[PDB]
Amino acid sequence: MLVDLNVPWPQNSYADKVTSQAVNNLIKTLSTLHMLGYTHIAINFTVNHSEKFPNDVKLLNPIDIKRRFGELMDRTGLKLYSRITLIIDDPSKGQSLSKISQAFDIVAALPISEKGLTLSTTNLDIDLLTFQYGSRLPTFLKHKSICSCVNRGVKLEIVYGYALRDVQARRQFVSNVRSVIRSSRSRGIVIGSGAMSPLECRNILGVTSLIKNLGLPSDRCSKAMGDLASLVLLNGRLRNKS
Amino acid sequence: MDRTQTFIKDCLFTKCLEDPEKPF
Amino acid sequence: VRLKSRYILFEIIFPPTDTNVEESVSKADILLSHHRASPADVSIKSILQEIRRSLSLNLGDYGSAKCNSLLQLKYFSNKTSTGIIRCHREDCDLVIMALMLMSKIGDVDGLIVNPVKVSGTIKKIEQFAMRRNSKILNIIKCSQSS
Amino acid sequence: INGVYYNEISRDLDISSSTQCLRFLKETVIPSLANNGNNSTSIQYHGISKNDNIKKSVNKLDKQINMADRSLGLQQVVCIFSYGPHIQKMLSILEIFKKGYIKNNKKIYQWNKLTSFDIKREGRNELQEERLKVPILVTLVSDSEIIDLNLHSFTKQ
Amino acid sequence: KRVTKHPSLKTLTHKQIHTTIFVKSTTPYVSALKRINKFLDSVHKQGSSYVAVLGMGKAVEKTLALGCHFQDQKNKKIEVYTKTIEVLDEVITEGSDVEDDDKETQLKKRAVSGVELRIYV
Amino acid sequence: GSKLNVDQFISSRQFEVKQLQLAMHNSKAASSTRIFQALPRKLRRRTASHNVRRIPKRMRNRALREMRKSDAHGLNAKQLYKARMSIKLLRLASKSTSMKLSMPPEVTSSNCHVRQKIKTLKRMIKESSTANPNIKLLNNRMGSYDCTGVNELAPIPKGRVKYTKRQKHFAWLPTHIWNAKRSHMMKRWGYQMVWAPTQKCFKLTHRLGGDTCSSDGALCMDSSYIGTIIVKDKSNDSEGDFLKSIIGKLTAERANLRKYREGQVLFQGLIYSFNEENGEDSTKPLGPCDVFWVQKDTAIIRLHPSIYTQVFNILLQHKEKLTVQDCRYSLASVTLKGAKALESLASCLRSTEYSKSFEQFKMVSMITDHNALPQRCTFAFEAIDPRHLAAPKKLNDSQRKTVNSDDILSLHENYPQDEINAVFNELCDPESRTQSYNNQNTLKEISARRYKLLTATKTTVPFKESDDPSIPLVIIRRLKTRDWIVVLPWFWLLPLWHLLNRIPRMYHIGLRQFQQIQYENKQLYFPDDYPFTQLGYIENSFYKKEASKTKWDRKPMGKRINFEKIKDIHNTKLPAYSGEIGDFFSSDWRFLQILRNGIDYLQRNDKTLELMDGVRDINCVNDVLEFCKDYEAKTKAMSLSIEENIPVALCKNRKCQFRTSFSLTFFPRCIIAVSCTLLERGHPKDNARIYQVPEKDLEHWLQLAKGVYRPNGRKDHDLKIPLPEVHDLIGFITSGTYHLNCGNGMGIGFIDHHAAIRQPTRYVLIRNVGTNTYRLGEWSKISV
RNA sequence: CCCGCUACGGCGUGAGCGUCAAGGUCUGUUGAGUGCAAUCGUAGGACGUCAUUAGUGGCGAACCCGAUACCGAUUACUGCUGCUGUUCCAGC
RNA sequence: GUGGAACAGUGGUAAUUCCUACGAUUAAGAAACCUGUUUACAGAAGGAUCCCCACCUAUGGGCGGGUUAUCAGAUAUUAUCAGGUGGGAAAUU
Q1: CATH class for domain A3-241?
Q2: So what's the architecture of E1-5+14-121 in CATH?
Q3: Which of B8, D97, E79, F238 could form a disulfide with D155 if both were Cys (CB 3.0 to 4.6 A apart)?
Q4: E65 touches chain D (CB under 8 A)
């Protein structure tokens, strides 16, 4: 049984309304995820830190797992969880965590800044850290900021779905992922599929070979994909329930 | 009850009795 | 020490890239919609020429040098789109990662490759493939009877 | 137990409640497998729970095999049924009844049917949901060999 | 009163033994699925029509669960038969201080209803 | 890519499955180059490439055509006479044992001359030619005699003139060369008994002779080593007064009951050696015993051969009134085990008279079951020599295809006591077994009789009441070991034994395989699983200790496991002690019993026990452990043969109430025998340590028994296991093997009864040899 | 060969038995059992040897991989052990 | 004659160092692979206590009919899992 926790929602801003093609494309790519054979699906949604958070309770999540995906949950034989990655660069218009953690399940972040990495490791009780594997590396990865954050409990995430986008982006992808592997001490590595189309989904045998040749051993990879993934799912679930 | 029988396969058989014994 | 080679079973899956037409949600129906058919110009030499070009443009020259020592397609038929690639036991990682990065054929695009079964012998892989296809026939027959 | 499904359709049942599931077996499952309209059968329904007296239920089965009219030419079928861990007690009330019948130089013609409910429960973990399956035994007994019911899916005994 | 039990008669030929599983109460479900699958794989070599699944008592319910799995999910034709089982039990009849197992053993019969379940190929 | 229909899809995939199956079958057909590889692995013969006769007759023609497609010495003037002496000795021995007469004792001893043997064999034929009297004339053509020793032990048997100096040190089985060509045997006692078959038969004997239901076969053990004595009361012709007394002296009051007198079933139990010199009685645990009675008075007792010599010595000590009968070379049993053992056994024998025992045995032989039958099944009859058949044939009547327990109820009431006990009286007496050899024929003679039936008249030889050797045959059930044993005279066993496995679903057993069978049925074994008795402790401890010590000192440094430096074994590591509990090898019960008496002395000294800091003041554990190490260092110089250290408790708990001076080890410690099955991951091995769960973290082991898991969905045991102290040891496992009939690990352990009554729960943790993990399981009591 | 129908040899069931034949099969396969020939990868701890600039790093080799099992003999290499022979160096 | 160093010949003996954890499936045998969890039973086979109605007797109680709660060794879990993997020559026609 596997956990895929990095499927993006085709919307970036709350003012933009999701068209009928994007919902059908998301149903296509999640059926493609179930086609190769998966168990857990945690779809992701992207917000900016400069964006003004709404003061609502039942409107914080424009995902609606119950009314749309509640039929596919019964028909297909899977389940969905909602999660947010935080595109944080500067400490301004923010510092609110007591409300966004109760609505959603898993709280992630996207630091692209040097001080952003420090404020993510310091005062963000989040689950996973995501780096931009598409664009360039921000400054330099060190053991000092990583080892203090992995030992706290926050895991580092590698997006193997961003590699099947372009040709030139693959080089920067490998340069980012091998840097994450040499800085992570091969422990806190959770991998996820960032696919927007059904043409970019792969199975466990190819992805395990990918992460094995990029520099993570076969014990740590499979042990991570089972144990650490299903542990951070229960971490989010107990932050919800308790 | 293990497969590696030291006393049985050498000292106690009739084929390896001519060999020096395992107590010796 | 003999020739300890490993065989890899792969299957070509076509995702239903159609946003304008609606979709049905079922198990064996989506198995029908993904396991449709292979196109016309698909043979052994075409898949070998495509995978050598992907091996060149993705992994390079010396990686292709290590891979192409015992890189052959032993069995393939276009009616079921399942193939068996012989390789070394050390470069099996490289062959599976090359099978993963297969983006498109030069004639038909919009397809993914699924590496399913890896073993050091072809006789157990054929036995597992017959049982997997038997399970596929079970799912098809269960959705067809009801 | 989160929910009870029969034939992949959502149903409102409770496994700990015996009466509701026995009435669901009586009203829905048996008309879905046998039709009493297009023939001349007299079907007497009976369900068995694990709290039933064996002797009293066999004595109740002693009156249902001779209940309908003999002059109308109606063949008399007893449909006994149970589900899950009660079925074993059913089997006793089955076979002792056979022990009460074969000594008089007569025969029971028997048809068996096995289907299931699919219940949903929470597993060892909250994210892991278990699908358990509850078996159903339906037995149609009669003194006639050939019955015009749609009994092709059954098992002749 | 101390009483001990014995298993039941199994009258089997050369071909009936390799195609019959006897389901215990401590038998796991997935293990029973694996063994009936192995029997369906080997029944072509044994050359017979069905694989028999026999249970008595506490196993009967989960034995029926076997017939609830292969009939629907694998499209196998099953036959359900209800049989009687005679079991001999050694009981002690009171008639010094002796060890508990070494007393007067008297045989008593006891009938248990059970389920045979045949699975076709 | 284009969507297709459902029927076309399932037809294409089914055609692909059929094409792959046909391609695999064609590759399997093209892969074989000969039909010699078509044979199963059991029947493969290396000689079959040379000669054609090993191959089955259907396959020999293809073997002949593939073999055709693929394609008296110098001897001096002395060694020629040295070779002709042996040939003349063999010819004169054949003529002497064939014509009329028996064996001289001078030829039997074979320690004086061979020329005197030639002169004696020349003289006996001339004396038979010149005169009828003064001849020890036999009763048959084959060289069979009566090796029965009345009131004394049986000597070395005569056997054959050729293989006589090969029988100089150890004796042989009647199937000795037969077992030698097909099995690995060992020379341990005065016989040479089998150890294991040559082909690998661990899982094979486990599935066919085991407790598993899928046991479509039969397994035969040559159990001629088990020695029996026959005792009869000479004092009175009436009821046996001294028999019940001598049974109550040899055994406990457990095997001398009225039920065993009435129902006359054989009982196997525990015998203990008594010794009464003058007003004092000393009892030591001796071993296993099999007791059987004939209606009131005569008794056969059979058990282990060294224990047989000791019991025969004790019985010859007090031999005042009753006459003893030693039977080492005139009576032996073989053991059948499985589901179709009764069918093959009824296939091997035929009837000579219509009697009740034949009907009862043929009704038993059809049910294909063991435990549904009652406790008593002891059948006996008169049968034909099985050399009349010499072919695998089974005989079965119509019987209307019905098997019920109502026929089994007729087995408990209608028992033919008279004829069965008459066959018992025939086998016990030396005159009737001598009369049985009155018509024994040679293989040439039975071949000539088969040729006479082929000329006159079917594959049989008919029975004649005047000139056919009607044998006595006894087949009895043995209860706890779940196996049917059949007993017969010594020279009669081989015509029965040769026809057994020619039934094509019958294999032979080694004593290693017999130990596997006793391990599978939760039973016990005397050389290995009996450490409490004297001989078992001495044999097991000394031989396995010397063997493992030679094996450990033989290995070079840095390749074997190092017993000296193992870190993190117990919590609060004690000073001057860095090793494992007791001896690393074969189970030192001395360490366990001294540690148990030390903890008992600490509990008698104070309500609690301290952990750590001519005999020094005992206040904690390490003062006891240094005394253990000092006693081991003293007993490495001089061997211990004074007393035992660990008896059983199951005979002591019921009546003696298990009740237990500057003493540390004088009063021994009693144990009960348990069988513990693993609930956690792992398997046990030999010489395993059994601990107890402490007063703390009991709920942790209860939660691990209920369930502990990582969130992936599977079981988790990569956690900080709490380490108990050194003195929490409560037992030893002698035999540790992954139990294939349970799917887990079985360890035959022996735990203290006081420690058994300490914990209210039956949870027991196990630790292997040189491995620092602790594995939980649950035990059941072995009432053997 | 026993049961029922029919009666010139016949027919239907026993998941019955005996004989004969068939390149239809033999994972009926072994505390490893493949047969276009599996016998794995990684992490941590324990032990041994060798070299260090601060205390760690490297190594656990070589021969060879069966094809039903067993035993004996020969041949390829490492380490230990006893004996023999040779060379070099002294205690008086 | 002795002790140390080196070499050579023969005889005997051993070889994954050992342990621990992990390596996708309701499509229930995909870490490369094999075997195992089948002599079917909770002294629940006329099971035990208990509810209502009618009958007979009275100091206790029993029978008949109907719905039918509780109980079956750690008040629990029916749907998991374990073990092992090339050797002294398997080699040599």
Answers
A1: alpha beta
A2: 2-Layer Sandwich (3.30)
A3: E79
A4: yes
